[PDB]
Amino acid sequence: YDIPTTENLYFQGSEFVPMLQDSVPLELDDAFMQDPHSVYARLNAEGSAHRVMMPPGPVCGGLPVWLITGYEEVRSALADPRLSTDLNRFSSALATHMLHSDPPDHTRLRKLVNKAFTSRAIEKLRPEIEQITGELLAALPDEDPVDLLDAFAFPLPIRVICLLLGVPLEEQENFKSWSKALVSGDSPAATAAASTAMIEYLGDLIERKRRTPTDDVLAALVSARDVDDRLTETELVSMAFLLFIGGHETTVNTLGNGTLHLMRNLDQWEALRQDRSLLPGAVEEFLRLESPLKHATFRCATEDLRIGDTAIPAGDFVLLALASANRDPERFGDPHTLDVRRPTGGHVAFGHGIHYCLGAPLARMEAQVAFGVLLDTFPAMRLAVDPEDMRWRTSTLIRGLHSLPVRLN
């Protein structure tokens, strides 16, 4: 750190020092991870696109990307044909999924799976969901500190995803064991074994449901020979895997983020209890205020592009901050406070454009059932520790909590 003084004096007196200082990409420290909404507002005050750099962890590398902040600038980017999720500008099922597909080929996969994710067709799963939630609160621990995130938020999608693919009751516990292994890095070998076991088992379920149709939505996906074309045996597994990882962490932190807020907006935690007709707006307001996905998946510039009067060269990586657009005061009045009664439909927590959340209707209902069952029962709830001591997990795209310590009271 003992840099030669003459060299430093040469740079300081050059008057190029601010320009070189400006061109450095802003490293996203843990302060951003805890409180990015202040960082987004600090950035959007000056522009819409900013050169930022994630800390080593995208794998082990400080990756210079473009962070886009404005609501309309985010929204237009999510619908821009020049901003592809295919970064290319013997493939495994983990690399061929629809989320990474450009509209040329994405349209076919999106339409085939569309029919089975209808709001009403997704409502068939509700009593199977309603009952599944109820077991976890009965099995909830007895003492005051409960860590709601671990005991209820974590297991709920695991049983819901098991319903989604339509796992047979006999082969249930094996699938959940694979799922909990995959979502928690207990050891490199256990997740590696579970990942293969699930992909191979999913492929066998593809064959099993092929000749034996069943009520569950995965069988509806298999039965979808809609255009005289059907999803291929590889594409079924890729679609099913994307449902698993694309739905697990999102639904967990949808519950955790929402429940965390009402713990300090108890005057709105109450209001939800007296009126259950506000729940469909409660979930939307939860997703807008504290979107589980801070940013959409990485996008690459197809051609030369302009965002917020800042040119983006082709081949550059762009990160669309959904949390910034959701908390833009220009689109949502007083964006930093939870108001359950806002008009909905303007938020982009489910993204926008062609890659709009396929599991949105499932995620929509899930929290209302989760919150409502959490509302019908156990209403003396109170947060067990001041949020200042609580942390946020270090993640690239997800906004989630390390824990949700609650007191049942």
Ligand code: HEM
């Ligand atoms: C619970 C709250 C959820 C949130 C906030 C959320 C958020 C998102 C976002 C922002 C995207 C677009 C990402 C991008 O375009 O870069 C997306 C896509 C997707 N999500 Fe989620 N999601 C949620 C729940 C779920 C669930 C429960 C499932 C499945 C069971 C699911 C499956 C998918 C799939 C398959 C896509 C890709 C759709 C496509 O590419 O056409 N999501 N989601």
